[PDB]
Design a protein around this ligand. Sequence first.
Ligand SMILES: Nc1nc2c(ncn2[C@@H]2O[C@H](COP(=O)(O)OP(=O)(O)O)[C@@H](O)[C@H]2O)c(=O)[nH]1
Ligand SMILES: [Mg+2]
Length: 162
Amino acid sequence: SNRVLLLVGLPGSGKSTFSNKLVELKPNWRRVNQDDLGSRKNCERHCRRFLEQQLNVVIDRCNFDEQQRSTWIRIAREYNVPVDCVVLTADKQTCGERILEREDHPTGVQGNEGLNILHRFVMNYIPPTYTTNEGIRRIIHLDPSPEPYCTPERVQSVLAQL
Ligand SMILES: Nc1nc2c(ncn2[C@@H]2O[C@H](COP(=O)(O)OP(=O)(O)O)[C@@H](O)[C@H]2O)c(=O)[nH]1
Ligand SMILES: [Mg+2]
């Protein structure tokens, strides 16, 4: 049956990379991203509309602590569907290098922001684990690929683990 999929990762970890590919390859999947959907109230609505059509839904947000993820777990329970999770394991170094690549942040005294931003997220980042009392069915950790782009095989490999 259909299921809700939580992406969890630092800025620049590759969450959009992955979720975009998934929805491209699989038409029974939809993607909730705030850069495309705006407010959270709006994201919740879309999420509800997709579950109403028994579609799978993937949540492209840092989802950096229990509170952030609950929103979606809560909606999933509403439609009696499970919630799995994909944690991107890319480290502060990797993300930092990716964020510099984009060169769209102020830079100089008071630091290069974006590295700052990353640092702020890092300090509030609580990924799901065995112990957190959240009601997630399965947590899979995903390591970075050599390739900047996400292969169909990579998507398949992830989905194959529930
Ligand atoms: N090598 C490698 N680069 C990746 C991977 N995932 C994403 N990237 C790159 O990292 C950058 C940030 O990815 P993006 O999806 O925007 O990150 P998000 O901010 O977590 O949604 C982009 O340049 C991607 O090409 C991965 O698995 N491996
Ligand atoms: Mg993104």
